[PDB]
């Protein structure tokens, strides 16, 4: 309707329009060139002097005598419906399936109003994955937003695929009867290349999850600024399907490193003073407003559990992207290169991962009473084995004493018969029995954190 012309300046993602009084702050503008092409753009600074618009697509072909700028949606909104569980979307939610769009039940703000911590709830109920490391030591429960770090080329996609296809909350040990509803996957991808895309969609059509899932694909060959909109647009639908229909939404936010590179690009186009390694200061607030739109609320049986996949640049816990992620979120799962050369699938090193809220998930009745002491004894014994490996590499094998060989046999028996597994799905009882098999290698007395009841009931 009310167009604007008078573009003064165009460079990078930015363009400077003038005499722009009535563009509300943070609105959507479509850019129209000479010949019919229309582009997305978001407003990020308004004055009666001028206004600034970032461009959701490539800035190729814009002249200055044309390319009018037209207004829509004072704040950026997504039309949202429930006829939505089968069709994929681009980086800005145009559907690419050869079908008409959703008939919107509602209109929601894509930014997300911040959740009230009074209206939250303790994330209680255990989720098993099949993977014994997670389901023994680093607990994954309903309502947690735990990221999975990846190294250079470690199979993060296959870990996410296995937790997508074969993770299930177990109602029977929780003691509530059952409703046994399976999950609902919000898979939002930000610059996965083509091969990972092929693997995820073929995995989902082989497990039959595409009748209950949604994909917001923002590929590598897509333009580079709509990555800022993709996770917030996905988590809007996630909030929707959780908190209006009593679901158990699991959200796979793939490869946050491309989100952070796009954020770095939009922060450096506007000259803004960065923190460490060239990332701007508001990256904390934006990763917060992605992550903390997740959790459980009181009374409503909807729920959101997130796996964000990180890619650590120099496979370290110290770079600003995994560092600020691990400061924001609660509990993470880290992969490592050192186990991966030994064929160990899935290559999870079990020291640096930590569940934040294992303590409320497992315990009496819910999992089994042993589980906390069992996990703590495994942590302490395996850490002792790992840091005695370096001393063995210093002083040689024949310079060893008693219990050193027991810790070392514990270490490699652990790393080849607890973490090392195929795509088989181990239960909680099966993984705990394998844990007692590995705890059978140590003589007693050193099993300090396991109390007398468990050591007198389950040794062997």
In the window 133-152, what residues touch other proteins (CB under 8 A)? 152
Decide whether 119 or 399 has the Cβ nearer to other proteins: 399
- The dihedral region occupied by 396, where left means phi > 0, alpha psi between -120 and 50, and beta the remainder, is left
The three-class DSSP label of residue 9 is: strand
User: Which of the stretches 59-67, 327-335, 362-370, 373-381 binds other proteins when contact is defined by CB under 8 A?
Assistant: 59-67
Q: Is 420 in the site for other proteins (CB under 8 A)?
A: no
Q: Is 4 in the site for other proteins (CB under 8 A)?
A: yes
Q: Is 109 in the site for other proteins (CB under 8 A)?
A: no
Q: Is 427 in the site for other proteins (CB under 8 A)?
A: no
**Residues 65-84 close enough to bind other proteins by CB under 8 A:** 65-66, 68, 79, 83
Residue identified by tokens 């936010």 is 253
Q: Rounded distance, CA 225 to CA 262, Å?
A: 6
Output the smallest distance, CB 442 to other proteins, in A.
25
User: Which of the stretches 56-64, 112-120, 362-370, 452-460 binds other proteins when contact is defined by CB under 8 A?
Assistant: 56-64
Output the smallest distance, CB 454 to other proteins, in A.
36
Contact present, 307 and 163 (Cβ < 8 Å): yes
Q: Is 2 in the site for other proteins (CB under 8 A)?
A: yes
Output the smallest distance, CB 305 to other proteins, in A.
24
Residue of 26, 30, 74, 86 that binds other proteins (CB under 8 A): 86
Decide whether 11 or 424 has the Cβ nearer to other proteins: 11
**Residues 194-213 close enough to bind other proteins by CB under 8 A:** 194-195, 198, 210-211
Contact present, 141 and 167 (Cβ < 8 Å): no
For CA atoms 458, 420, 329, 145, the dihedral sign is negative
Q: Is 342 in the site for other proteins (CB under 8 A)?
A: yes
**Residues 230-259 close enough to bind other proteins by CB under 8 A:** 255, 257-258
Decide whether 35 or 116 has the Cβ nearer to other proteins: 35
Helix then strand count (H, E) for the chain reads 14, 17
DSSP output for 77-124 = EEEE-STTSS--B-TT--B-SSS-----SEEEESS-PPPPGGGB----
Q: Is 393 in the site for other proteins (CB under 8 A)?
A: yes
DSSP output for 171-182 = HHHHTS------
Residue of 48, 63, 180, 181 that binds other proteins (CB under 8 A): 63
Q: Rounded distance, CA 386 to CA 393, Å?
A: 11
Q: Rounded distance, CA 424 to CA 166, Å?
A: 10
**Residues 165-194 close enough to bind other proteins by CB under 8 A:** 191, 193-194
Q: Rounded distance, CA 23 to CA 241, Å?
A: 32
Q: Is 153 in the site for other proteins (CB under 8 A)?
A: yes
Q: Which of 55, 62, 45 is nearest to 272 (CA)?
A: 45
User: Which of the stretches 134-142, 170-178, 390-398, 434-442 binds other proteins when contact is defined by CB under 8 A?
Assistant: 390-398
Q: Is 452 in the site for other proteins (CB under 8 A)?
A: no
**Residues 259-278 close enough to bind other proteins by CB under 8 A:** 261-262, 264-265, 268-269, 271, 274, 277-278
Q: Which of 123, 201, 204, 212 is nearest to 169 (CA)?
A: 123
Residue of 172, 176, 314, 402 that binds other proteins (CB under 8 A): 314
Q: Which of 205, 219, 167 is nearest to 423 (CA)?
A: 167
């Amino acid at each position: 309707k009310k167009e604007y012309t008078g573009i003064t300046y165009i460079s990078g993602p930015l363009l400077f329009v003038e005499n722009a009084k009535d563009l509300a702050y943070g609105a959507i503008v479509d850019i129209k060139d000479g010949t019919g092409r229309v582009r997305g753009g978001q407003v990020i600074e308004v004055s009666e002097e001028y206004a600034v618009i970032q461009v959701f697509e490539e800035t190729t072909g814009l002249d200055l005598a044309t390319t009018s700028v037209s207004l829509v949606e004072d704040v950026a909104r997504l039309g949202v419906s429930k006829e939505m569980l089968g069709r994929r979307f681009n980086g800005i939610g145009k559907p690419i399936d050869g079908l008409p769009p959703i008939t919107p039940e509602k209109r929601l703000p894509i930014t997300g109003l911040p959740l009230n911590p009074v209206a939250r709830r303790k994330p209680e109920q255990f989720i098993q994955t099949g993977i014994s490391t997670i389901d023994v030591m680093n607990t994954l429960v309903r309502g947690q937003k735990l990221p999975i770090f990846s190294g250079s080329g470690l199979p993060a996609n296959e870990i996410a695929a296995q937790i997508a296809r074969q993770a299930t909350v177990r109602p029977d040990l929780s003691g509530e009867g059952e409703k046994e509803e399976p999950f609902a996957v919000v898979f939002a991808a930000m610059g996965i290349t083509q091969r990972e895309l092929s693997y995820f969609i073929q995995e989902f059509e082989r497990t039959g999850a595409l009748s209950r899932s949604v994909l917001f694909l923002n590929k590598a060959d897509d333009p580079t600024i709509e990555r800022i909109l993709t996770p917030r647009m996905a988590l809007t639908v996630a909030e929707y399907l959780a908190f209006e229909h009593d679901y158990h939404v699991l959200v796979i936010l793939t490869d946050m490193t491309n989100y952070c590179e796009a954020l770095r690009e939009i922060g450096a186009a506007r000259e803004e003073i960065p923190g460490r390694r060239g990332y701007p200061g508001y990256m904390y607030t934006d990763l917060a407003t992605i992550y903390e739109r997740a959790g459980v609320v009181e009374g409503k049986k909807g729920s959101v559990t997130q796996i964000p996949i990180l890619s650590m640049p120099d496979d370290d816990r110290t770079h600003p992207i995994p560092d600020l992620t691990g400061y924001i979120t609660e509990g993470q799962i880290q992969l490592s290169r050192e186990l991966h050369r030994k064929g160990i699938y899935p290559p999870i090193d079990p020291l640096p991962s930590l569940s934040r809220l294992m303590n409320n998930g497992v315990g009496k009745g819910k999992t089994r009473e042993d589980h906390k002491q069992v996990s703590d004894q495994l942590y302490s014994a395996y850490a002792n084995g790992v840091d005695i490996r370096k001393l063995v590499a210093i002083i040689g094998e024949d310079a060893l004493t008693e219990n050193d060989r027991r810790y070392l046999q514990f270490a490699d028996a652990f790393e080849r018969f607890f973490i090392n597994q195929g795509q088989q799905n181990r239960s909680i009882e099966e993984s705990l029995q394998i844990a007692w098999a590995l705890l059978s290698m140590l003589p007693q007395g050193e099993l300090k954190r396991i109390s007398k009841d468990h050591i007198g009931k389950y040794y062997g």
